[PDB]
């Protein structure tokens, strides 16, 4: 219609925020010797893996936070981690240009996916095919046969580092976000972008799918946008700006969107209304700089009740819902609908 017309529609009909209980940080785990950069939860929900700038992958007990195992095989930072839901496999990528399949029955690297020309930044397992997708500084999403280690496909078109990656079973089966400020939705059968989304002004460092809805969120240093699938229809911006580079985004089944800032902020938003009900800043562990405070990864556990964050003060932090909270004792940041008339 217009920006004015749509702004009046928006003042009338914006979905109100669903009340979400606040989250509190209940656990710091020290022990990585570099920035914790990636997290991944195992589908059983009993351990998580964190990769680091100290080049290791640590396996942690999800309920005690206990170091179960350290895995060394990367030469540089571990930048991405993906635990398979269908295979007893963990996948890691790293700044060493290397993608590794870890056999979790051996605790050993059994396959290596060779071919990234620069450091690898993002990883994604196809949820239904035995295929993995990695993006890196060579601006390219490399699509790998899990079994034969073969590079089945190269998704070309981005211009800078592919920083975020999504994989789903419906079309578009790969979503990438890049430092070139675009999101490509890919047709995995054709090897071609099915859509290029140019609404972001900064680089898209975080993508997240909605667990249940056909929609994803992308996050920049400037906005978190929400997009409808298959075609990547812009739904909306979050109703506030985390004034931070967002490194990580996780979405819950309750629709809690967690976004984690390069400055160590953690904002919790209502998916579906776009409204942030919580805003936190990290505390950095003793010794750290407060410059060294970013929030590089976050995942929810499989139930959605825990959020594990991988931080630049080299900690894993764990957050649980203060779910003994009720919309009366704990509403959080309160909502004013987007009443403005603005230009879009």
């Amino acid at each position: 219609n217009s920006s004015a017309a749509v702004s009046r529609r928006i003042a009338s009909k914006w979905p109100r925020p669903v009340w979400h209980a606040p989250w509190k940080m209940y656990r710091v785990i020290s022990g990585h010797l570099g920035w914790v950069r990636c997290v991944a939860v195992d589908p059983s929900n009993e351990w998580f893996a964190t990769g680091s700038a100290d080049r290791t992958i640590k396996i942690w007990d999800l309920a005690s936070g206990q170091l179960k195992l350290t895995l060394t095989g990367h030469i540089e930072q571990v930048t991405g981690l993906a635990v398979s839901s269908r295979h007893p496999y963990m996948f890691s990528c790293g700044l060493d240009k290397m993608v590794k399949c870890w056999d979790l029955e051996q605790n050993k690297v059994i396959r290596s996916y060779h071919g990234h020309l620069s450091g690898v930044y993002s990883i994604a397992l196809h949820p239904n095919l035995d295929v993995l997708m990695t993006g890196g500084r060579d601006s390219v999403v490399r699509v790998w046969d899990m079994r034969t280690k073969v590079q089945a496909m190269v998704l070309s078109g981005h211009d800078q580092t592919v920083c975020s990656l999504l994989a789903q079973a419906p079309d578009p089966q790969v979503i990438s976000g890049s430092h070139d400020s675009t999101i490509r939705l890919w047709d995995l059968r054709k090897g071609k972008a099915s859509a290029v989304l140019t609404h972001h002004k900064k680089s898209i460092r975080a993508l997240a799918m909605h667990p249940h809805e056909f929609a994803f969120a992308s996050a920049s240093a400037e906005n978190i946008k929400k997009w409808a699938l298959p075609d990547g229809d812009f739904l909306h911006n979050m109703l506030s700006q985390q004034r931070a580079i967002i490194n990580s985004m996780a979405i819950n089944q309750d629709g809690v969107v967690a976004t984690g800032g390069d400055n160590g902020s953690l904002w919790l938003w209502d998916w579906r209304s776009g409204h942030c009900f919580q805003q936190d800043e990290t505390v950095v562990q003793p010794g750290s700089l407060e410059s060294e405070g970013a929030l590089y990864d976050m995942t929810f556990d499989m139930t959605g009740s825990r959020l594990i964050t991988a931080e630049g003060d080299k900690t894993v932090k764990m957050w649980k819902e203060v779910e003994d909270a009720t919309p009366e004792t704990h509403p959080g940041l309160p909502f004013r609908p987007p009443k403005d008339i603005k230009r879009f």
């Binding site: 020290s30 059983s44 309920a63 269908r86 071919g115 390219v140 280690k149 010794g287 556990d301 139930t303």
Partner: protein, 104 residues
Amino acid sequence: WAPAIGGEKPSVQQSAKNLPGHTKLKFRQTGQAAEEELRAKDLRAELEAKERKHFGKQSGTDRRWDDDVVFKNQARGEPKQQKRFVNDTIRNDFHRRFLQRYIR
């Protein structure tokens, strides 16, 4: 300043690392968190169970020879050292111990 971009008869040069290996995939069986096995359970029950177990079962509750000597009691007052993580490159304890060990 700018990396190489990595876009994609076939060449018949065969690498050694590209010879067949691990030619079948392991799948998660019944007992290794397989997807059909995991819909069946309440993972929140097991998580809150394990967290309560950990958090409670870590809490554990439901004149002499030394008369000319000029200094007495000089160890008393010394700090007993602690298992702590300092996020400092050079001011952590591994490093202080390392430099103590290797520099004489």
